[PDB]
Amino acid sequence: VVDPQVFEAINLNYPGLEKVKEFYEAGEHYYAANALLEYYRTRTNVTNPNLSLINVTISEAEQAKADYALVDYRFHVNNFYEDKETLKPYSVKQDGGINWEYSPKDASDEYQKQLHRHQWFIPQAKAYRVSGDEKYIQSWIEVYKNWIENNPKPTTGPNTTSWWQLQVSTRIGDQVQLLEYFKNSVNFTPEWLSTFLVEFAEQADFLVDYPYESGGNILISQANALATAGTLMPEFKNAEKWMNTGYQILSEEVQNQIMSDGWHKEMSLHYHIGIVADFYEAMKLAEANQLSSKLPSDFTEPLRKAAEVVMYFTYPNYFIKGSDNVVPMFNDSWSRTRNVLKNTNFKQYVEMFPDSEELKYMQTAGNGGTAQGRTPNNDMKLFDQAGYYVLRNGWTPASTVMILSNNKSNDASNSLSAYSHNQPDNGTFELYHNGRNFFPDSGVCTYYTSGGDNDLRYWFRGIDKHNTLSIGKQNIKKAAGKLLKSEEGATELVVFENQGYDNLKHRRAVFYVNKKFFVLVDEGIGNAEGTINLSFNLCEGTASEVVMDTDKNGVHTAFSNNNNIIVRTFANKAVTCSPFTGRIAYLVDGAYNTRQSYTIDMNKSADETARYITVILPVNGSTDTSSISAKFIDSGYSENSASVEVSVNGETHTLSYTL
């Protein structure tokens, strides 16, 4: 039957709804709903820049999602598969019906959260458009009806699954498209339209009622969904409220959540890219619908340095073809493809900033493309709000790029607890050199599990699974990174510190010697007593490709392509080299590969400062004859200076700084 609430939700006075209003007022609910269907079938009043219905295509992966949903309710959920090889989702079927509370045995909270995003609906819509097969719309209608009936909105605010703001906002963005994909089907009945529209208004009203209380990315996603609902479905009585609330929150949050160095406050590259996308897409949405006045004239200004962040966080192997990862994976952030960076991220940045020759180069040179524009120079790039420092000798695949992390808690990232997107990893770094990332971050592997097993979650968060200094491999308790000094020149220098523990501060100085190799001078400062661990987590390889030189307090690589490194650590006290098996996860799917790691251990007494010198030397070919030594040449630790001497292949370097 036609749900009479459709006539309460919709403004029957909206231009174009004259036949709907006439039928409704004469008590002809069916013919009114039918007129409303014809209205949606023929309207030309709105434009969604995110959807094109000219020449719709479907990928193999999307086709699998569309088809799996048709048998045993195998509903696609990102990162969760019964059989990954065949992209087979878990079945949510129980006792012949749909169990909306289903979760596989080892699953984090992300299974339930994403199941309620209905991630197979858009694939079914595309499958419908491509095939013309009505089974796809019939499935959507049947399953979405079942969802509606069995997942009532809470009356008090969000829950953590079906009615968590990010689930609701995701559904809204999909549903504005699902209407356009499916509306011409004979199975898209006036009765169905009434239910679809009533439940759409339910989603959007909910988002107005409950602005996400902890801000961050979820609030931005919510605001974008509200702008989308209000702009693209203006026929609803509450649409103006949806749109105005959305654009208002976006105008506020583009200022609130992007720091003065261009970084999103949550300090995750992934979420940074995501919030910039939400802002960009709301701007394009407003522009396409004569609503640019809903946003400030300077709306995109914070996005300029934000796009520059992405440029500096893309490694040079992005410029060639390949299937490997091309970004750092610091904090809750993971792998990213060339195609996503090239044809989504940099595509949007170029569109926003058409005069940037640097972003043009990023977009065009990506994936072995024909380069237009040009890169920045090779100067160090310091992000002193998020705490990231980027050193490089170029932008070419043959170049070297070190990114150091030294993050700093803020109002949107106030915790280092297991559920935080910020890891307790101050001082850690990655190192790209001549096509190989020699120190890729351990990554995420899994999100948090309520009441559950968080072993894997904790494992990947561990400080010693990063490349830094810790005491007793215990996670630091405070992220308050401070940049102390930077110097340009033949040898570049960055010195920074973090008071990670109340009685032990880590100061790390990195000399980029002749912009060729690295010397790290690490100091554990304070009255803490115990074992200090300087940790290193190397690139993947066979046991023969990454080889511990335990007798020499370091490691070397022996890759057949001759692109190698050798690493050696020296110290102010006796040390022990302690290999361990590390791990790296590229996706948030619970999987990982092992890789070689180690710590350099020393006993620190209360009245001592732990001091290490580490040399990281890229070598073309065999590392067998590379010769490294180092020592302190000052009298010991002091607040205001440090001085070391390093010898590499018969050349001696004196490396000193004063604050």
In angstroms, the CA 155 to CA 148 distance is 15
Rg of the chain over Cα atoms, rounded to whole angstroms, equals 28
Gaps in the chain following residue numbers (C to N > 2.5 A): none
Can you spell out the DSSP letters for 528-558?
--EEEEEEEEPPP--TTTEEEEGGGTEEEE-
Q: Determine which one of 181, 247, 271, 657 is catalytic.
A: 271
Report the CATH fold assignment for 378-659: Beta-galactosidase; Chain A, domain 5 (2.70.98)
In angstroms, the CA 464 to CA 472 distance is 9
In angstroms, the CA 534 to CA 427 distance is 11
Residue 21's identity, in one-letter code, is: K
* Three-class secondary structure of residue 242 per DSSP: helix
Closest CA to 315 of 399, 429, 425, 427: 399
Sign of CA dihedral 388, 394, 396, 401: negative
- Domain chopping of the chain, boundaries: 1-377, 378-659
Q: Which two tokens stand for residue 527?
A: 């009255």
For residue 368, report the phi and psi dihedrals to the nearest 5 degrees.
Answer: 70, 20
Reported as half-sphere exposure (CB side, CA atoms, 13 A), residue 326 has a value of: 25
What angle, 0 to 180 degrees and rounded to 10, lies between the N-to-C axes of helices 190-209 and 239-256? 40
Can you spell out the DSSP letters for 154-207?
PSSS--SSTT-HHHHHHHHHHHHHHHHHHTTSTTS-HHHHHHHHHHHHHHHHHH
β-pair partners for 496? 483, 508
Q: Which two tokens stand for residue 374?
A: 């040009």
Instruction: From residue 541, give the alpha-carbon distance in Å to each of 334, 401, 547.
Output: 20, 20, 9
Q: Which two tokens stand for residue 25?
A: 């007022």
* Architecture of the 1-377 domain: Alpha/alpha barrel (1.50)
Q: Is 96 left (phi over 0), alpha (psi -120 to 50) or beta?
A: left
Cβ contacts of 141-150, under 8 Å, gap ≥ 24 = 141/187, 141/192, 143/69, 143/73, 143/75, 143/98, 143/118, 144/118, 145/195, 146/97, 146/98, 147/98, 147/100, 147/116, 147/118, 148/195, 148/199, 150/98, 150/100
In angstroms, the CA 5 to CA 10 distance is 9
In angstroms, the CA 163 to CA 166 distance is 8
Q: Which two tokens stand for residue 302?
A: 């914070």
CB neighbours of 89 closer than 8 A, spacing ≥ 6? 65, 68, 69, 74, 75, 76, 77, 80, 81, 82, 120
Report whether 318 contacts 341 (CB < 8 A). yes
CB neighbours of 432 closer than 8 A, spacing ≥ 6? 315, 316, 317, 399, 400, 401, 402, 438
- Is 271 a residue of the active site? yes
For residue 111, report the phi and psi dihedrals to the nearest 5 degrees.
Answer: -65, -60
In angstroms, the CA 39 to CA 44 distance is 9
Report whether 319 contacts 335 (CB < 8 A). no
Q: What angle do CA 186, 189, 191 make, to 5 degrees?
A: 170
Q: What resolution does the deposited structure have, in angstroms?
A: 1.6
Can you spell out the DSSP letters for 571-593?
ESS--EEEEEEEEEBSSSSS--E
Separate counts of helices (H) and strands (E) for the chain: 17, 22
In angstroms, the CA 444 to CA 318 distance is 21
In angstroms, the CA 315 to CA 597 distance is 23
Q: Which method was it determined by?
A: X-ray
